[PDB]
Scaffold this active site. Structure first.
Site, PDB file in Angstrom:
ATOM      1  CG  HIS A   1      -1.842  -1.127   1.352  1.00  0.00           C
ATOM      2  ND1 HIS A   1      -1.463  -2.319   1.930  1.00  0.00           N
ATOM      3  CD2 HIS A   1      -3.144  -1.272   1.010  1.00  0.00           C
ATOM      4  CE1 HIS A   1      -2.485  -3.156   1.918  1.00  0.00           C
ATOM      5  NE2 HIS A   1      -3.517  -2.545   1.365  1.00  0.00           N
TER       6      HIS A   1
ATOM      7  CG  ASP B   1       1.579  -1.197   3.654  1.00  0.00           C
ATOM      8  OD1 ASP B   1       1.198  -1.078   4.838  1.00  0.00           O
ATOM      9  OD2 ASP B   1       0.990  -1.914   2.819  1.00  0.00           O
TER      10      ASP B   1
ATOM     11  CG  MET C   1      -0.821  -5.667  -6.927  1.00  0.00           C
ATOM     12  SD  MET C   1      -1.018  -5.442  -5.141  1.00  0.00           S
ATOM     13  CE  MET C   1      -0.789  -7.114  -4.544  1.00  0.00           C
TER      14      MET C   1
ATOM     15  CD  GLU D   1      -7.829  -8.325  -1.664  1.00  0.00           C
ATOM     16  OE1 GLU D   1      -6.961  -7.488  -1.985  1.00  0.00           O
ATOM     17  OE2 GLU D   1      -7.784  -8.983  -0.605  1.00  0.00           O
TER      18      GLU D   1
ATOM     19  CE  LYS E   1     -12.138  -9.199   4.736  1.00  0.00           C
ATOM     20  NZ  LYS E   1     -11.323  -8.386   5.679  1.00  0.00           N
TER      21      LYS E   1
ATOM     22  CD  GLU F   1      -7.309 -12.501   1.394  1.00  0.00           C
ATOM     23  OE1 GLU F   1      -6.766 -11.438   1.028  1.00  0.00           O
ATOM     24  OE2 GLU F   1      -7.688 -12.705   2.564  1.00  0.00           O
TER      25      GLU F   1
ATOM     26  CG  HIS G   1     -11.178 -11.900   1.227  1.00  0.00           C
ATOM     27  ND1 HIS G   1     -10.685 -10.775   0.602  1.00  0.00           N
ATOM     28  CD2 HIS G   1     -10.657 -11.894   2.478  1.00  0.00           C
ATOM     29  CE1 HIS G   1      -9.898 -10.119   1.437  1.00  0.00           C
ATOM     30  NE2 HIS G   1      -9.865 -10.777   2.582  1.00  0.00           N
TER      31      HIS G   1
ATOM     32  CG  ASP H   1      -4.410 -11.308  -2.433  1.00  0.00           C
ATOM     33  OD1 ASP H   1      -3.449 -11.148  -3.213  1.00  0.00           O
ATOM     34  OD2 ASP H   1      -4.932 -10.371  -1.795  1.00  0.00           O
TER      35      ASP H   1
ATOM     36  CG  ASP I   1      -9.716 -11.662   6.179  1.00  0.00           C
ATOM     37  OD1 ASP I   1      -9.574 -12.801   5.689  1.00  0.00           O
ATOM     38  OD2 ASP I   1      -9.158 -10.642   5.725  1.00  0.00           O
TER      39      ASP I   1
ATOM     40  CG  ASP J   1      -5.806 -12.128   6.145  1.00  0.00           C
ATOM     41  OD1 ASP J   1      -6.537 -12.658   5.282  1.00  0.00           O
ATOM     42  OD2 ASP J   1      -5.699 -10.891   6.281  1.00  0.00           O
TER      43      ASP J   1
ATOM     44  CG  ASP K   1      -3.711 -10.051   1.828  1.00  0.00           C
ATOM     45  OD1 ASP K   1      -3.157  -9.747   2.905  1.00  0.00           O
ATOM     46  OD2 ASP K   1      -4.679  -9.414   1.360  1.00  0.00           O
TER      47      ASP K   1
HETATM   48 MG   LIG Z   1      -6.045  -9.693   0.014  1.00  0.00          MG
HETATM   49 MN   LIG Z   2      -8.113 -11.514   4.182  1.00  0.00          MN
END
Ligand SMILES: [Mg+2]
Ligand SMILES: [Mn+2]
Ligand SMILES: [Mg+2]
Ligand SMILES: [Mg+2]
Ligand SMILES: [Mg+2]
Ligand SMILES: [Mn+2]
Ligand SMILES: [Mn+2]
Ligand SMILES: [Mn+2]
Lengths: 386, 386, 386, 386
Positions: D53, D56, D87, D180, D182, D216, D219, D244, D254, D256, D286
């Site tokens: 990001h 980030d 990306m 993406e 979700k 993802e 997700h 992802d 979520d 992850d 991710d």
């Molecule tokens: Mg993701």
């Molecule tokens: Mn996630």
């Protein structure tokens, strides 16, 4: 219209209206609230009392001097408003030291520190007049299968609660414990995930009469379970010591919406159950004003919690008082459900030929239950269509 | 390779391999199986025994003469094959008379008939040598809130099980009861939805030592719950009388896939738990060969149930025997989880300054749990990458 | 009070009120209904029309003579009652031949037979005056990963719908197609599980303007999705050709409860959306009277479907007409949501310093959304508290 | 053994291994990582590149001078390690200003600021050589029904993406967009919840060829959906621009988790699909190292992501290369699924009497699909039992 009074036993956690709006993907959207402020505004809204984690009232790491100062500040706000403190709890989930749990952390020294942190807040809760002490083991669990032997963790959880029950009896404290279940989040799976698991665990404690459950609407709905059904089993076992009211939209993250939101019909059947059974504990709202709100929306959401309960209470009372509903309940044989199946005894049932050899199984099978007319009557009453 | 033997205690319900493939949106895709046929083919596959509903073995409404003939037929098949009958159960869910339940039906006369139907199958189960009698209350529940007062239903459920326990003790029968929980389907919500709810209900029975749970893999996963965690609590309470093994893909309709399908990692952690704890009951498969299969696929699916357990048993045993895993378990302090938190007592813990006043909370917080390396080691062992 | 009229466009499937109550764990609890009977009783209740599978009206395997007789019987019932037939569909899921699907069955000859079965019912639907032909691919899917290459299945599904669109245009038929999505059951996973997946698939067809979606309330809620949100996207794409109304209690088996049951608030927001957007299609109820009901409960449940829509329609209209609500919608900037973000163009937005370099990000962040007061106003309107 | 190389196209987000462990109920358990550090350690582990990001890499509110300094720092780390940046994405979810969304915020000025924040990070991404720009609208949605008109929000979302596509074409940038999806969290319901909804929305954009999906694993599993099925539909539409990879245990928050965790069999079928279809994009993880881990556990979890993919890749390749599997695929008629249903045309199918009038529907229905033997073969291959 639908105005709450302190006699309605409506209570709020300091962490509820005080939630700064911080979720896993965003920063805080509201400034922190002074606990004295929260007691004043909630008293103005008609609330009956507040509840708190130890870390909600006394900042973590405060000295013994600031601690006393923070309590004296809080005590003065309760005196000026007439607000009670019916329940208190411990924060064993925020500090990084509890990342693997408190009572069931793998590290023994963290477990021992978790008990000391709970015990001195039990003293403070008793001094503030709390009748119930809640334990939400939000960090007791695991993300992977090998990280936790659940039998060993259940031994450590029973050890902790037995020690706490040994403390309160040896001190003469008049306080009972309420385990608040939650199936997951923040851990992948949390120990004692539902009301049933917590009720079964209590029966293995040294003094089970000291322990009950503090179920939350949304937590049982995070497992797709019928919350009114779980409360009924908790009441059936005489273990509904406390209740957490909020809203939740099905199986997902813990939303903590205001009460009445989420599953509206399930909220109606819960209020109907709580009032018919004569539940006399606090009506506690463990909810979060959405972080989209400013402070005016925070107090509007808290007021909606209390308003929604009162509307549902009125609709449920009108539902049970309706003679058409009472006649429909008999048409569906709700009166026969309350009658004992074999009060005549086992021997009489075995010799009763009308129960088997001469039972007309097709005539009984053809009898309609009439549940749909009864449910539509409940729907009309909830919606104010009668 | 991975060949089951009768000493592996693998059992199957007659209704499993005998499922004709009829779902709510389609007709049967397979002819009915003779119970004698099912006993013969399952014995050839290496199974240890079969189980049955009363209606699986004796067609509903059969006279006392055909009943005896059906049992003699079945008995001969067990004698010719060496197949056991470790558990039996009652069908209180198929006939239209049970549409509102059996033990907790609103109509009293249906409740009394449900008890008579159960009792005479208990006699048959004892005569066939069954040690466990299972009760799945699939019709005990409701679709709407007013159709069932759950407190009254719980009184009727306790009355029924108390009467059954009174029957077996007054007859000298050596048999125990196992409640099989299920959260929903066919009812909207089923009473005693999870293992926890069933365990708590058992503690309110007249003779709780006569009753345990028969959990099913997929049923607890229908509520998003961790099945190995639920089994551990059932074992912790000493109430794992029986187990139902199958597969399920998350929260949806009861799939009853063959064991190993669905959540594969959860199956690995369950076998690891069952074997480490020394579970000595039957390994029962309550599954359904998908209706896309002919009879060759039925026996292939049943064989896969037994094969998948044996593969997972080998991988779990290699996992626990690995010195790298044993060293990793110590690195994650699994040995400290098994140690008592405060064996020195409450007073010693209160005077232990190293537990609170002098506890280095940041040094403890900085200690990594090393759970990810441990979990990857379990993953390598499951996949045969070591 | 809340009396439906034929102009309300309320329609029912013959398979809805005609459901004999057969679920995966029980037999039928009601006798079969004559389609002529169902048309008469539904017309008496105020319904506008009926819908049907081919197998609902003509028994499977009927000769060409009985087929014509069955249609003439049905046609006479429509003439005597004034009942319309706005939509028809094909049963490609009940017969064992469709156990692996119809349009995407692995066997090619079953795929070809599935197209012939659909085509001749399209002729009958046009002759009966249906404007929409619905396709529910309930058997298109798999229980295991290797049983179906989804790319190949999507080629076979596109081939089937392209051929059907080629048939209706070459015949001059004035009829459009509506795909009804469902995430699972009876298959483990069904192809095109949600409204979004169906909408995306339609954009790859040869003549996409011939195809839309027929979403069902409960089906999208079986995936935990917000049904009003999905309808809005279907309307946004101009593809809401048809709708299925019922109730569902979260993520579980397809309940097919009567409309208004399940998620009551989501039903309110759906009716509010359907009426504000000017949806002029049929209000179709794909529901199942619970098998606990006799035939009197069947008609009570069907009447409740229509009553609940009319109550919610009135509450939603009073909600939007309330000046306090209209002022609250402006306070939450719903009027700004409808305004274009950058009608001035890309270049103007890039040179607009008030959009970035001089944007007061903290003043914007401090602006409360006032969503909670707006939602409580909607709650008061739904409950008749204002 | 199973050692990743940069040619394996394994990539990680800076926010993944850099996650400080902060969840809604706890504070951070790990210090922040220097992005230069993360690039160095990931390169040592065998990763091919990183993603980011804007926030980030450049702290929010940084001046134009510190921004350039932060990029020069980052650029040097990529040069010294050979790490790519395939990306990049925008953080439109963390700052309180995005509490009601970015592209679809109710406030117009916040929408305009969201576009400016995205555009200048598109410039930076192109300068760093990114081929894909990802948009996760985590704040686009609502908690209540009235807070968002979804049709208006979809207009604002289409406007934003059309403007971004207008920017990249007018600049000559060689970059494509990947939405993406979700379903929920942090919002109660997120717009474009699944892969299907995102694919359908793309077909309404001005230049649809510029936009694809970045699905993802977890997700889609948050909606109970089959992730391999969704990827297949994304590939079928030619819109799998990016992926992802992580793990998720069913319908809940979520998680992850690292890839391979969660649903292991679904991970196997996804790798089998990605490799058979020839997917040549980045293998992006991710995921979040659980906050129970120190920094050694962070790198162990990241290594497990890459190891688990390589093990599954080997097992899937051995699965497809097995002649017994190839013969089983023919036994289940997977070869017939790839054959066109009616390549002879509509007219030929209508005159083909073997497709309807003379179709032996019972002989076709009796043909077993043999899916269970095929699935057990896949299970043996996954577990290394052959
Ligand atoms: Mg993701
Ligand atoms: Mn996630
Ligand atoms: Mg709570
Ligand atoms: Mg079972
Ligand atoms: Mg439908
Ligand atoms: Mn909660
Ligand atoms: Mn099952
Ligand atoms: Mn349905």
């Amino acid at each position: 219209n639908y105005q709450p009074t302190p006699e309605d036993r409506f209570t709020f956690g300091l962490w509820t209206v005080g939630w700064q709006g911080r979720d896993p993907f965003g920063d805080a959207t509201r400034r922190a609230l002074d606990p004295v402020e929260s007691v004043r505004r909630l008293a103005e809204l008609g609330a009956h009392g507040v509840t708190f984690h130890d870390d909600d009232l006394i900042p973590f790491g405060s000295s013994d001097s600031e601690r006393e100062e923070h309590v004296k500040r809080f005590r003065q706000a309760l005196d000026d408003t007439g607000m009670k403190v019916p329940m208190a709890t411990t924060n064993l989930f925020t500090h990084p030291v509890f990342k693997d749990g408190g009572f069931t952390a793998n590290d023994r020294d963290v477990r021992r520190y978790a008990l000391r942190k709970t015990i001195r807040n039990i003293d403070l809760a008793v001094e503030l007049g709390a009748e119930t002490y809640v334990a939400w083991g939000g960090r007791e669990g695991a993300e992977s299968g090998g990280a936790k032997d659940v039998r060993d963790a259940l031994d450590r959880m029973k050890e902790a609660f037995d020690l706490l029950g040994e403390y309160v009896t040896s001190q003469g404290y008049d306080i009972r414990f309420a385990i608040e279940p939650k199936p997951n989040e923040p851990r992948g799976d949390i120990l004692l995930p539902t009301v049933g698991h917590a009720l079964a665990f209590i029966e293995r404690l040294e003094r089970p009469e000291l322990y009950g459950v503090n179920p939350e609407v949304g937590h049982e709905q995070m497992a797709g379970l019928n919350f009114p059904h779980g409360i009924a089993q908790a009441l059936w076992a005489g273990k509904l010591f406390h209740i957490d009211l909020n809203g939740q939209n099905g199986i997902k993250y813990d939303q903590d919406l205001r009460f009445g939101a989420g599953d509206l019909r399930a909220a109606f059947w819960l209020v109907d159950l709580l009032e018919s059974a004569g539940y006399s504990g606090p009506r506690h709202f463990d909810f979060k004003p959405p972080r989209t709100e400013d402070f005016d929306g925070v107090w509007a959401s808290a007021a909606g919690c209390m308003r929604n309960y009162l509307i549902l209470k009125e609709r449920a009372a009108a539902f049970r008082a309706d003679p058409e509903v009472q006649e429909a309940l008999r048409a569906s044989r709700l009166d026969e459900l309350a009658r004992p199946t074999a009060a005549d005894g086992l021997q009489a049932l075995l010799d009763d030929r009308s129960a088997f050899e001469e039972f007309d199984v097709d005539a009984a099978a053809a009898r309609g239950m009439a549940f749909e007319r009864l449910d539509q009557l409940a729907m009309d009453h909830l919606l104010g269509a009668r």
